[PDB]
Amino acid sequence: IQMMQSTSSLSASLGDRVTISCSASQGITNYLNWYQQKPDGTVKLLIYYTSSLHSGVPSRFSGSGSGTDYSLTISNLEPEDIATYYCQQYSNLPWTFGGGTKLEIK
Amino acid sequence: FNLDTENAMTFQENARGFGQSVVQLQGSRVVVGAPQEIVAANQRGSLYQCD
Amino acid sequence: ALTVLGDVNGDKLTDVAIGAPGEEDNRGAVYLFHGTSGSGISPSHSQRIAGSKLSPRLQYFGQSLSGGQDLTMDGLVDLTVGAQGHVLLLRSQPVLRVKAIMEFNPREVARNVFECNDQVVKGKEAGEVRVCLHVQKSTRDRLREGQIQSVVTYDLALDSGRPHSRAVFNETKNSTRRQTQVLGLTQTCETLKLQLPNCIEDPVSPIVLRLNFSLVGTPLSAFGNLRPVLAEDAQRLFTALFPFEKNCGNDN
Amino acid sequence: KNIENLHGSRLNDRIAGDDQDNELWGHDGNDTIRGRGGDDILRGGLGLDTLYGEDGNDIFLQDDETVSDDIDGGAGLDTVDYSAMIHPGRIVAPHEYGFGIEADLSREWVRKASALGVDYYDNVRNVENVIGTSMKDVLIGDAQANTLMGQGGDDTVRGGDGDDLLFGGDGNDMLYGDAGNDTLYGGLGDDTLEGGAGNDWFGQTQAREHDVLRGGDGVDTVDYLGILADLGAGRVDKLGEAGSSAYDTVSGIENVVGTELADRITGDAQANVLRGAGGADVLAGGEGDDVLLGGDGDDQLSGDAGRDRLYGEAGDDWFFQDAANAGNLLDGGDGRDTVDFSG
Amino acid sequence: QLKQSGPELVKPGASVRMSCKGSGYSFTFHNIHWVKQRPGQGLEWIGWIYPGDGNTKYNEKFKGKTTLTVDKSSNTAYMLLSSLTSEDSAIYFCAYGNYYFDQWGQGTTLTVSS
Ligand SMILES: *[C@@H]1O[C@H](CO)[C@@H](O)[C@H](O)[C@H]1NC(C)=O
Ligand SMILES: *[C@@H]1O[C@H](CO)[C@@H](O)[C@H](O)[C@H]1NC(C)=O
Ligand SMILES: *[C@@H]1O[C@H](CO)[C@@H](O)[C@H](O)[C@H]1NC(C)=O
Ligand SMILES: [Ca+2]
Ligand SMILES: [Ca+2]
Ligand SMILES: [Ca+2]
Ligand SMILES: [Ca+2]
Ligand SMILES: [Ca+2]
Ligand SMILES: [Ca+2]
Ligand SMILES: [Ca+2]
Ligand SMILES: [Ca+2]
Ligand SMILES: [Ca+2]
Ligand SMILES: [Ca+2]
Ligand SMILES: [Ca+2]
Ligand SMILES: [Ca+2]
Ligand SMILES: [Ca+2]
Ligand SMILES: [Ca+2]
Ligand SMILES: [Ca+2]
Ligand SMILES: [Ca+2]
Ligand SMILES: [Ca+2]
Ligand SMILES: [Ca+2]
Ligand SMILES: [Ca+2]
Ligand SMILES: [Ca+2]
Ligand SMILES: [Ca+2]
Ligand SMILES: [Ca+2]
Ligand SMILES: [Ca+2]
Ligand SMILES: [Ca+2]
């Protein structure tokens, strides 16, 4: 399942609301994940479902969607939110990642 | 006592003999014959399928 | 011309329609006869549709007939009538019945209510009557639940058939009451107080309550403005009794 | 005297039974049959028949015809069987909509046959169970407890109120439990099951098929190399391997019962009771208060977060626990159970 | 937490084995996945191995050049790369999880040149 992330780059100021959208070639029935890759090189898991929040992440992050369109939303940006974000699915083998969207502070 | 008379739909056709023979068909249409209508030369009679 | 219409009124007995194209100076009419238990046809008709009551252009209305199917997709049989230059589609309608029940509380008038007394306020007697109405459908069809609504008005008459009623309603202060309301296919209930202005010197006759109604069916917008109708044999009058307390001996 | 069964004539008959079990057949004609006491099998046959079962648990067998029948089962748990409508021979009654039979025990009728413009009904009263046909059907319950079986075809079943027992059978079926404490069996084929309000129960068979499971309000249960179940990710793999084509979609289910083989069960963020039964099972509870039961064999338990209570039962059980967690209970049961604080 | 081997330098045509070490909880309760990251590109999934039984599942386009092995005793996972080419220079990640990858390693750099 080819998975699309059209918006390659994004910019926002401290306190703004940011939306990252990822789309799929077919139905994924809510089987999608979101990951974060900081500039230092580490990779982290943010939400392990369409909306289920992980243990170690703050309440700022949130996700929603259904069918072929999904989105990750940042309610109130912070100076530690500079990283690349990927969308991954586990509905059909092989498991595929998204292209990636990069966030840089205005 | 429960037959509707104020909301009756009427089919009208100018063919001669229209309404002489009537029959319901397949729960959605009604067939009407026009025995005396002249379709063409040496032809008489026609059928209609009204929905 | 005559054909079979199937069961139209919902009594599980087959009904027929017979045509009279030559009536009213060749304008025509259609008669409807109900089927009866015993493999027979009722001797009198139940409906007469006249071409003059439909459109002035109709001639020979009823010269051809065909029935036994549903063409409106609402699960009710339909009748096709052929006339000179026109073909008409008459449609059956839902059939409705109403059942009514009346209860009193208390079931009987207490002794102290109507006994003669001088140190009491006259006309301050009490009571209660509970009235419940239920509208039900007889024919089986494919329309969804909750679409059928009707407006029902009715009369309540205390001591009907008596020049002067012993008991009066509290809100109107006379023996009659009119009320109209909209009903679905679900029972609804209403209660209202009963008051007595004077002592009853002939307690041997119970107070009698009478109810009779008229029903009008609202059209169905989804099925071409069809309106349900009341059954032609439906009971339209109901009665309950309100007896007095007995004191046959030593207040036993 | 001392006769239990009776077969009627080709004409109109009035057949009455006794307090024993009777099998009463009316054959052709219009017949009135009373079963009286006991459990009876009533088959009116062709014609307009009136059938009574009185007390006991009665069974009514219907035939391939358009003529209506009146059925009153009386007291007891009663059923009606419509299996003889579709048969390998030639069928006289029409099914031009392709819907087999349609049942509504709330409105007390069964649409036994249906042409495009004509609908044929049966009048059914005080009957709690229905059995469908080989084609697709629509089954609807009432406020009582009903047992609904769809048999073959792509059926739809609605249980209504009460505690029902719904069967899907072969084919792709739609089962709705509605209000009450229901029990849902899907059978062969790709089905979807939702129980709605109340505490429901689902039974699966570890075959090569895909099913969708929805547990609404209340605590709900699913029962089954073994299985790989991850309620957090909403996916269960039936044959134990992730990403397989034999998998289930799970949402709103709190309790899981494993297979006698070796299973892997993981719980979501809610309160979970996980049962592993026989075999070597791996159990993880996630976060929140959970109850773990490993059953027989050597099992491994996690209880990641929250105030959990862990039972190991028989076998050489292994426990993982965090030293900074509080409010936990452990019970190794029979065997050389080991606790590990290095997690 | 997963510990990976250090950076590696290799000549084309050779083979390199990479290590990924964890704990008993991770290898008992979770599968182990391997993910690559080419420079100036995204992330691609290779496959997983189940430490309890050693069963494997592979991405179709990586089937030929990849072999997954596990040492259950010491809780170490190994990936064997064969016929190294200039397209195989990337950073390789190991992560554990069933359907979502929970904990990621710090990464290992592979340099294919001469
Ligand atoms: C058929 O009808 C037409 C109508 O005008 C008539 O002219 C013709 O003669 C008829 N044919 C025969 C064979 O009578
Ligand atoms: C009840 O009957 C009286 C005559 O007996 C009639 O005038 C009245 O209209 C009836 N009630 C209704 C609601 O029609
Ligand atoms: C009884 O009172 C009501 C309401 O005041 C009125 O509509 C009705 O006409 C009265 N009946 C008589 C008989 O006066
Ligand atoms: Ca009739
Ligand atoms: Ca109709
Ligand atoms: Ca015997
Ligand atoms: Ca018989
Ligand atoms: Ca018996
Ligand atoms: Ca019979
Ligand atoms: Ca029969
Ligand atoms: Ca019986
Ligand atoms: Ca019974
Ligand atoms: Ca019963
Ligand atoms: Ca079926
Ligand atoms: Ca029920
Ligand atoms: Ca089925
Ligand atoms: Ca139920
Ligand atoms: Ca339920
Ligand atoms: Ca099925
Ligand atoms: Ca199934
Ligand atoms: Ca639930
Ligand atoms: Ca839990
Ligand atoms: Ca097990
Ligand atoms: Ca076990
Ligand atoms: Ca827990
Ligand atoms: Ca055990
Ligand atoms: Ca033990």
Residue C172: CA atoms inside 13 Å, Cβ hemisphere, count?
A: 15
Task: Characterize the bridge pairing of strands A61-66 and A43-47.
Answer: unpaired
Region for C251 from its dihedrals, namely left if φ exceeds 0, alpha if ψ lies in -120 to 50, beta otherwise: left
- C-alpha dihedral (A23, A29, A31, A36), degrees to nearest 10: 30
Nearest CA to ligand 3 atom 3: C172
Determine whether the interchain pair D287/A52 forms a contact, defined as Cβ–Cβ distance below 8 Å.
Answer: no
Determine whether the interchain pair D230/E99 forms a contact, defined as Cβ–Cβ distance below 8 Å.
Answer: yes
Whole-number Cα distances in Å, A104 to A14, A18, A96, C170, E90: 11, 11, 25, 79, 24
Ligand 4 ion local residues (Cβ < 5 A)? C 7, 9, 11, 13, 15, 34-35
CA distance A18 to C181: 56
Interface check for B18 against chain C (CB to CB < 8 A): the answer is yes
Structure tokens at D20: 């024993």
Resolution in A: 2.7
Alpha helices in chain C, H assignment, sequence order: 23-26, 111-114
Ligand 16 ion local residues (Cβ < 5 A)? D 150, 155, 168-169, 171, 173
- CB contact at 8 A, D155 and D138: yes
- Which one of B23, B24, B26 makes the best mutation probe of the D interface by having the most chain D beta carbons within 10 Å? B26
- CB contact at 8 A, D336 and D316: yes
CA distance D199 to D190: 23
Within 8 A by CB and 6+ apart from C151, the residues are: C180, C181, C182, C183, C215, C216, C218
- CB contact at 8 A, A32 and A46: no
Range of the domain at A19: 3-105
Within 8 A by CB and 6+ apart from E57, the residues are: A93, D241, D242, D243, E47, E48
CA distance D288 to D271: 6
CA distance D191 to D175: 8
CA distance D322 to D284: 13
D26 Cα to the center of ligand 7, angstroms:
4
Cβ-Cβ pairs closer than 8 A, D with E, add up to 32
Q: What's the gap between Cα D226 and its chain centre?
A: 23
User: Is ligand 2 within 6 A of the CB of residue C188?
Assistant: no
Q: Smallest Cα–Cα separation from C96: which of C152, C44, C48?
A: C152
Q: Of the residues C151, C176, C214, C216, which should be mutated to test ligand 2's pocket, given the most ligand atoms within 8 Å of the CB?
A: C214
User: Is ligand 2 within 6 A of the CB of residue C176?
Assistant: no
Structure tokens at B32: 């009407």
CA distance D57 to D36: 11
- The H or E element containing residue A105 is strand A101-105
- Which one of A43, A84, A88 makes the best mutation probe of the E interface by having the most chain E beta carbons within 10 Å? A43
Q: Which amino acid is at C37?
A: S
Question: Coil, strand or helix: which one is E91?
Answer: strand
- CATH number, domain E3-112: 2.60.40.10
Tell me which DSSP letter residue E84 carries. -
Interface check for D21 against chain A (CB to CB < 8 A): the answer is no
Structure tokens at C38: 């015993």
Ligand 6 ion local residues (Cβ < 5 A)? D 2
Question: Coil, strand or helix: which one is C252?
Answer: coil
Interface check for A6 against chain E (CB to CB < 8 A): the answer is no
Q: Smallest Cα–Cα separation from A21: which of A57, A68, A76, A81?
A: A68
- The domain locations on chain E are 3-112
- CB contact at 8 A, D324 and D306: no
Task: Characterize the bridge pairing of strands D119-125 and D102-104.
Answer: unpaired
User: What sign has the CA pseudo-torsion D201, D205, D206, D210?
Assistant: negative
Phi, psi of C182 (to 5 degrees): -100, 130
Report CA Rg, chain D: 26
E12 CA: distance to closest CA in chain A (Å)? 26
- CB contact at 8 A, A93 and E57: yes
Name the residue facing A97 among E42, E61, E104 (closest C-beta). Answer: E42
HEC letters along chain D = CCCCCEECCCCCEEEECCCCCCEEECCCCCEEEECCCCCCEEECCCCCCEEECCCCCCEEECCCCCCCCEEECCCCCCEEECCCCCCCCCCCCCECCCCCCEEECCCCEEEEEECCCCEEEEEEECCCEEECCCCCCEEECCCCCCEEECCCCCCEEECCCCCCEEECCCCCCEEECCCCCCEEECCCCCCEEECCCCCCEEECCCCCCCEEEECCCCCCEEECCCCEEECCCCEEECCCCCCCCCEEEEECCCEEECCCCCCEEECCCCCCEEECCCCCCEEECCCCCCEEECCCCCCEECCCCCCCEEECCCCCCEEECCCCCCCCEEECCCCCCEEECCC
Across the beta sheet with A32-37, the strand order is A9-12, A101-105, A84-89, A32-37, A43-47
Question: What technique determined this structure?
Answer: cryo-EM
Place of tokens 């003889």: D84
Structure tokens at C229: 């109708």
**What's the structural domain count of chain A?**
1
User: Is ligand 3 within 6 A of the CB of residue C171?
Assistant: no
Within 8 A by CB and 6+ apart from C121, the residues are: none
Looking at chain E, the residues that come just before a C–N gap of over 2.5 A are: none
Q: Which residues of C participate in the annotated binding site for Ca(2+)?
A: 7, 9, 11, 15, 70, 74, 78
β-partners of residue C179 are C154
Name the residue facing E57 among D230, D243, D302 (closest C-beta). Answer: D243
D88 CA: distance to closest CA in chain B (Å)? 26
Structure tokens at E32: 């182990």
Q: Smallest Cα–Cα separation from C47: which of C76, C20, C13?
A: C20
CA distance C249 to C240: 27
Whole-number Cα distances in Å, D90 to D43, D84, D93, D116, E57: 21, 12, 9, 19, 52
- The H or E element containing residue C153 is strand C150-158
A29 CA: distance to closest CA in chain D (Å)? 9
Region for A21 from its dihedrals, namely left if φ exceeds 0, alpha if ψ lies in -120 to 50, beta otherwise: beta
C147 Cα to the center of ligand 15, angstroms:
24
- CB contact at 8 A, D57 and D78: yes
Chain D CB contacts of B28 under 8 Å are 116-117
Q: Per residue in C96-132, is it b (16+ CB within 10 Å) or e — as a string?
A: bbbebebebeeeebeeebbeeeeeeeeeebebebebe
- CB contact at 8 A, A104 and A10: yes
- Which one of A28, A47, A54, A55 makes the best mutation probe of the D interface by having the most chain D beta carbons within 10 Å? A55
CA distance D129 to D162: 13
Atom of ligand 3 nearest to the CA of C178: 7
Within 8 A by CB and 6+ apart from D31, the residues are: D8, D12, D13, D14, D15, D44, D45, D47, D49, D50
Whole-number Cα distances in Å, C78 to B30, C148, C225, D97, E1: 11, 19, 15, 20, 77
C19 CA: distance to closest CA in chain D (Å)? 23
- CB contact at 8 A, C139 and C10: yes
Chain C CB contacts of D109 under 8 Å are 140
Nearest CA to ligand 3 atom 5: C172
Question: Coil, strand or helix: which one is C241?
Answer: strand
Name the residue facing D300 among E23, E28, E57 (closest C-beta). Answer: E28
A106 CA: distance to closest CA in chain D (Å)? 36
Within 8 A by CB and 6+ apart from D302, the residues are: D283, D284, D285, D320, D343, E25, E29
- C-alpha dihedral (D89, D95, D96, D100), degrees to nearest 10: -120
Determine whether the interchain pair D118/B27 forms a contact, defined as Cβ–Cβ distance below 8 Å.
Answer: yes
Report CA Rg, chain C: 26
Within 8 A by CB and 6+ apart from C39, the residues are: none
User: Is ligand 3 within 6 A of the CB of residue C170?
Assistant: no
- The H or E element containing residue E108 is strand E108-112
Q: Per residue in C69-81, is it b (16+ CB within 10 Å) or e — as a string?
A: bbbbebbbbbbbb
